[PDB]
Structure formats: structure tokens, C-alpha cells
Assembly symmetry: C2
Homo-oligomer: 382 residues x 2
């Protein structure tokens, strides 16, 4: 881990060193041949461990620097566990290893669907959380990123000409204002039609979800939150889709005053999606809305990602919960994160029904190793 931690692999600098090293390391520890696959994006490290087991599992990870947590240790911890089970011959599950708005990546998976078949899949991993209790996230919100651009002429005009032209700042401001109401509810027609109610189990988890409001509010730094009750906060943070403005720039915004009609304006939007919303469908709904709103400019989109919620009752989740309790001594389980990851690629392109994202202090790493071990042993028998 220290050797893996020391090597840097950022801008695309010094990456091949870790890729070849990792390709060299998976073999030494597990004894199985490790493949390094070229791609339009960045190369992918792939390895397969077959114990002729009933169930097959997919493991997913991604490969100041003196080393004295972005998979800086989560990757190594899971590896030594499988190594520890291989030596004892107690391993009873097939394991495929895949090491990586995520615009690319999907291209690799689509051309290797048969190779990557598995009953369940485990994502990059989950941290220890503020409480120190093991945190298990059962999914992610989807994503749609959009940029809107208005360009009404070749140059800014002196503002004295304002009576003669349209101003793109006010135009784009008005467009943006039609997207949501005062309380943040999205006004795009059909936006909520695909949002499904929560299951009873999903509702139970949100109720059980323990957030300290005062600590959350303090850590955010905003003068005021829309909600004060912890139940309400959990519900909104994890269940509500959004239409958020990440950016808006137009005209002169430096010190003093330069009086003009700008010729160009743009704004960046991100939509957090929940099941069963489709980013491509939402994108179309947005375009229809913009047209009715008189939008006269350019639309650019990227980072289309699908939302995911994997049943807590599924054997892979049961295995993750019961194993954590044994090693950590209660695990905080949530139906999905507020954020977004390419979990949806493994559910809808590989058709892998059950996906979980769980399992730096030195004591945390060793725990992650044991937590991995206990899961790999309990999953086959569940």
C-alpha cells in the first residue's frame, strides 16, 4: 500500500507507471494473469479469478505523494483480502477486477459486456464517515450537465444603445427563471412524471438516516438551510431531483464601472436525477421547454448518467451490512448518495442487478481488508 501510495498517477502525468505496476502487482498477490487493455479513453486494468463458484462478483476501483483517499488505499485493501482467501482455499466466489461527467468510459464497457458479466458489482468503496461507523451507499443520483449560450452580435456595445437591441444577460436570466419556482421545484413539463415513489424499505432507511443538523449546517457554511428537521433534510438531500445553476457569466464584472450591452452570455446547469428519470429524456424535455420559452441560442450537454437504487434485501447488500457489523462493531445505510457516479453503467450496460458502493488511518485500511474478507466469505453462503 505504501508503494502504491507513493507512486503518482494524476493531467495524465505519470499514469502508466501505476498501471504497469498494478498490472505487475495483481499477478504477484493473486497469482492470476492481469490484463492491461487499451481504450479510446485511458487504459483499463482487468483481471479474472475463477474458483468455479456459483456466484460471480465484479469489483470496481480507479488507480502530498510522500504517503507519510481516492482509492489510494481502498484498492489495496480489497486486494489483500482476496489474496488472503486464495491462500486458504476458502474463496467461494468468482471475482472480476476492473480498475479505471465521465463522458468516456462507457465506450469500453459496451464492447466488453460478455467479459464483464457478474451477479453483483461493488463500486469504488465508501469511507468511514464522521461517526466512524461503516457507511453503505446503495446507489447514486443520475446527472445531466448543460451549458446555455446566447450570442447576439460580434462585440459589446456601449449601454447608451440599449434601447435599440436585446440584452442577452436579461434574456438568459429570464430563461433560467422559468426553469424552477421560488422553492426550487422544477417547472419543466414532464420532469417529475418518471420519478417513482420510494419503496417501504427505502423510506425506512431515510427515516433511520442519522444526520446532526447543527453539524451539517456548520460544515456547509450557509447562513440558512431550507429545512431544519433531520427527517426533512435526509429526504430532500437523497430523494429530490434538482435543477441547479453552477455558473452564469455575462458582461463586465470587474472593479469600477464599464457601461455596456454585452453580446454574449452563458450559464451552466446540472440536474441531479432520481429513479426512474432518464437523462436523455430529461434533456429532451428541457429542449421542448426552452423552445416554448423563446430560447434563441446554443445548447450543449454532457455527462449523461442514470440514477441507481439497488435493493437492500438483495444478498450482496445483506452480506455488506452483516459483515461490517462484525469488523467495525451500526452501519449507516442509505438508498443512494446525494452525488453521482457511473454506477449506472454497470447496472444498465452489463445488466448487473445488484450494485453496492461500500467497503487515511492505518487502522482503517486493515479494517477495510477484514471487512472485505468477511464479505467475500458471507456472500457465497447467503
Amino acid at each position: 500500500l505504501i508503494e502504491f501510495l507513493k507512486k503518482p498517477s494524476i493531467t495524465g502525468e505519470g499514469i502508466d507507471e501505476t498501471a504497469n505496476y498494478l498490472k505487475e502487482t495483481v499477478e504477484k498477490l493473486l497469482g492470476v494473469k492481469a490484463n492491461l487493455e487499451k481504450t479510446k479513453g485511458h487504459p483499463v486494468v482487468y483481471a479474472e479469478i475463477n474458483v468455479n463458484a456459483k456466484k460471480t462478483l465484479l469489483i470496481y476501483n480507479h488507480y502530498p505523494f510522500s504517503a507519510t483517499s481516492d482509492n489510494k488505499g481502498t484498492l489495496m485493501a480489497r486486494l489483500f483480502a482476496i489474496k488472503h482467501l486464495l491462500d486458504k482455499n476458502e474463496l467461494n466466489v468468482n471475482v472480476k477486477l476492473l480498475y479505471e461527467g465521465s463522458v468516456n468510459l462507457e465506450d469500453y464497457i459496451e464492447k466488453n459486456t460478455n467479459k464483464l458479466k457478474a451477479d453483483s458489482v461493488i463500486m469504488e468503496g465508501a469511507g468511514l464517515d464522521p461517526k466512524g461507523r461503516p457507511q453503505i451507499v446503495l446507489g447514486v443520483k443520475g446527472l445531466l450537465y448543460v451549458e446555455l449560450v446566447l450570442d447576439y452580435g460580434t462585440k459589446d456595445l456601449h449601454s447608451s444603445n440599449a434601447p435599440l437591441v436585446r440584452n442577452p444577460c436579461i434574456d438568459l436570466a429570464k430563461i433560467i427563471s422559468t426553469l424552477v419556482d421560488m422553492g426550487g421545484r422544477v417547472l419543466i413539463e414532464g420532469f417529475y412524471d418518471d420519478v417513482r415513489e420510494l419503496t417501504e424499505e427505502e423510506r425506512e432507511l431515510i427515516k433511520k438516516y442519522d444526520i446532526d443538523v447543527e453539524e451539517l449546517k456548520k460544515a456547509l457554511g450557509f447562513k440558512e438551510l431550507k429545512y431544519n428537521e433531520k427527517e426533512k433534510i435526509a429526504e430532500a438531500l437523497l430523494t429530490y431531483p434538482t435543477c441547479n445553476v453552477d455558473g452564469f457569466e455575462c458582461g463586465y464584472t470587474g472593479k469600477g464601472s464599464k457601461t455596456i450591452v454585452p453580446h454574449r452570455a452563458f450559464a451552466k446547469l446540472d440536474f441531479r436525477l432520481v429513479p426512474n428519470q432518464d437523462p436523455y429524456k430529461v434533456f429532451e424535455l428541457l429542449k421542448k421547454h426552452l423552445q416554448k420559452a423563446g430560447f434563441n441560442g446554443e445548447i450543449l450537454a454532457h455527462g449523461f448518467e442514470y440514477p441507481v437504487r439497488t435493493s437492500v434485501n438483495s444478498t450482496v447488500v445483506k452480506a455488506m451490512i452483516e459483515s461490517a457489523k462484525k469488523v467495525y462493531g451500526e452501519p449507516q445505510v442509505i438508498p443512494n448518495s446525494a452525488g453521482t457516479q457511473p454506477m449506472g453503467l454497470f447496472v444498465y450496460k452489463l445488466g448487473i442487478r445488484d450494485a453496492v458502493s461500500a467497503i487515511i488511518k492505518i487502522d482503517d485500511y486493515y479494517k477495510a481488508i477484514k471487512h472485505t474478507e468477511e464479505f467475500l466469505k458471507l456472500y457465497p453462503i447467503l
Copy 2:
């Protein structure tokens, strides 16, 4: 090269960007010294809360007194890369002088000075002249009123001429009988100490959207201002004023190409003239919030701000409009800071004053074409202070070393050397004629 041209070049080589303050004090001192040299009277650097004012009186015991206003400060020159010649080289090429400030407003300032000199040298000056050169015109003349209010008796005059006006696209001299008023405003929202991961969006208000919603309430889609009471003080045009607008000569296609916008709101020339000269505005100069630049960064920004300028027409009071705006922002649930500056009054004066008449007739004699007379400029100038605070009703903006070709407020600003000489000439004829009418 005669003294008229040489001195102008010398003047133009001195930077005097009021926005940064670069060269302001040197220029004011040179100008003071130059006034004394050329006219042989005492000139004074007078202090203000900001950049200094150059003042001088040329008394010839005449019955009439003229107050002449100009400004020695110039616009910034960034980006320097777009300039073919250094902004302050005052390079001569193609019988033109290339420098920031050539048109707005040093050429016109210096022409007038040399006209006065010529008349003095011939004992032909029959009007007392008071000179008032400020250094903050390009930054809204912030500290000019305070100076004027303490020197009202000293600045007494029967008439006033403002910074002046260049030749129109057809090359005809322009006579301008007023200005639109002005109110700069900055709105700021700050909801937290730092940007948040947009994944938190359901928990908080977003300042970008809130501010976008606020500015959206200010105007309808056509640009009409929705602030309650905004138009109440706006008075109808006089018959003469309506007449002048009808005569205002606009090449619509040449104008459209000059501006460079894909579309204009109007196609008829009279409608453009009306909108440009008669409509008050609520314009957004800027809106900044959250992440800008290449690629995607996902956040809830904690801060958003916008900059607005309101162009005003008679009888709107900028201080009143500010109050109306504030009442409006209350109702719209505005929750942030409001900062204002550059309060300027709109102005319109009579075409029938002798100073205007003297200006029309002199322009006609010197340029040999029909002067174009408009009731006010689309832009702003501190004419309001002279008319309302000093009580000088007879005010006009005319005489100009520059023209349509001049690229004022733009790179490669320049004036034709021949236009500089005609400007001196226009001023001479104006000064000979004003006292006899």
C-alpha cells in the same frame, strides 16, 4: 508643424486614465501650465476629494461670460494588443493623429484653447471666459458636484458649453442640447462563506437563480421598465423636440453594421431615433456567479452579483429612481447589498438660446453644411450640474475635433488633423458671434 499641432501631440502623449489614476496628476499640472503659457492668465489646480480640477478666468470686461467645460482624463486602453500603434504615441499617419483621447476629449479641449489664444492675440475676444477642466468625466464625475457646490459664485456665467460633439457619419457638425441621466447600481447576494457541492442543492437557496429572478422582475420582454413609478416623472416631448427627432438623420443599415448585432429592435429610421434619444432604460452591464471557464464544475455558488445602469430622461431624478428601485427590490424579496454611484440628472435646453444660435451659425460657416441638432445625446455627461446646480439654463454641447471615424471608447482612437484645425476655427467663429447676438 505649428504650435497648435505640436502642443496637441505633447498633450496626447501624456496618459491620464482616470479609471486607474495613471498620469492624472501630471496631466493636470501640464494643463495648468499650458493654459498659463498660451493665454497669459493665472490658472489654478483646485483640489477635490479625488482628481484635481484646472480652473482659469480670462476677463476682458465684457458684458457676457462663458463657462467652458472639458475633461483631461481619458478611457483605459486595454487590451493593448488590439492597438496598432501605442495608445499614447500620438503617431501621425494618413494626416491623422492616433492616440487615446484624440477625440474624447483632448483634441477638442486644446482646439478651444488655441481659438481663445488667437482672439486674445488680436484683441478680438469680447466675452469673458471661465475654464473648468475635470479629470473624472470617464468615471462619472464622482467628485465634481462637491467642488461646484462650494464655488457657485466663482463659476457664475451667462452660458456654458459642455465637452463638445464630433462630426456625424455624413461629416456634418453636431449640436447637442442635453443628455440622458444616469444611475449605476450593483446588486450583491452572499449566502454563505464558501461554494458547496451541487449535490447539496436541495438543502439551500442558490444565489444565481435568486438574483436572475430579481433582475427578471425589473423589465418585461420588450425592455419596458416594470419598477413602479419609473415613468411617472417622464414628461412628453415638446413640439420642437419632436421635430428635431424627425430630422435626425440615421442610415439604418450603416448603423446596424457598425453595432455588429445580428438584429435590431427597429428598422425605421425615425423609430430608431426616437428609441435612442427618448427612451429611459434599465440595462444589465454584468452578471457574475459561480464557476466560469472550460469544462464542468458542479457547485452551488455562495455569491452572485449584477451591475445595472439606468439611462434617464426629463424629469426623472436619479436619487428618486434609486428609491423606487429599492422599494421594488423589497417587494421582490431581495436579500442582499445594494451599491449605487454616478447619479446624473437628465437635461434638455432650448434651441433658441443665443449660445445655441451662435453655435449653429458658426458651425454652418466653418463646415459649409447644415449642422445636425438633437435635443439630447443617447449618452451621459455632467451637464445636469451646470444647468441645475449652477443654474445656467443656456447650455449646449458642440464643437468637436473628432468625428464618426474617430473610434472613441475603442482601440486606435484618432482624429483627422484637418478636423482639429476646423475645430479651432469653429470655436473662433463661435466666440466672435456669441457676444454680438
